[PDB]
């Protein structure tokens, strides 16, 4: 907690996520495995998410 009221909150997770693969070129296949996260219970009128740094440097 910074004096101005800014909070930093980090946690360590192991995430297992669905990566729907299309195995037509197997085993010469490339895939794009997604990782989608957002707010349960809060719509875009209440909670929005943004990347902390430039999007290309935020993961």
């Amino acid at each position: 907690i910074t004096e101005d009221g800014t909070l930093l909150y980090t946690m360590r997770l192991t995430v297992r996520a669905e990566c729907p693969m299309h195995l037509e070129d197997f085993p010469m296949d490339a895939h794009a495995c997604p990782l989608k996260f957002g707010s349960y219970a809060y719509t875009r009128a209440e909670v929005v998410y943004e990347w902390t740094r430039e999007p290309a440097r935020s993961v």
Partner: antibody
Amino acid sequence: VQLQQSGAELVKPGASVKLSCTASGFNIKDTYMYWVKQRPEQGLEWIGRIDPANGDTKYDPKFQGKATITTDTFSNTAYLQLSSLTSEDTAVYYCARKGLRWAMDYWGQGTSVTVST
Amino acid sequence: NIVMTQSPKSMSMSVGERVTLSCKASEYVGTYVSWYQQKPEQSPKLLIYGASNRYTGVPDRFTGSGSATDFTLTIGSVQAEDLADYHCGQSYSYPTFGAGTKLELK
């Protein structure tokens, strides 16, 4: 919400300049700050940005060394300082803040830097 | 560096007709593409942020459309107060802007 830039400046070639941008309506700590130059009838060129929360700054490679950006949390101002400038950078300079989707939602009015003798 | 190519460089047109401005991205820039309007001797004004998100105060006739590397700004019922430079800028990486499109009345 309101960015107030310094006035226009005439500068001798080879000298130094210090442009200012006073933010009203928000804390500069809460966003990133951007300096953007624009030559007459030409595209926008990005100079660099600063994070007032930490002071971490990034510069366009062609402005590395030549430009430096600093902040002042107390006065809510961002400063662009041009160490050694030739006649080529006789362009307007814009102060902008980061917006919703990393867009630049609020720009300053622009400080006209003209250089001659 | 992500270079953004803006087409056409300049285009003249008449009032009240659909005009579309295209921007091309060198690399992937997901939807962090913005469209700015610059009237003469005025600072740029954000029109579209993200891909297809009108900024507050932008008339509903300004429509943004996007992709991974291809974006367009479409003006619908054009008016006479739309004569301005239009710049596209990416924000996926450190920001870069295109040359711009100088709208003309004809």
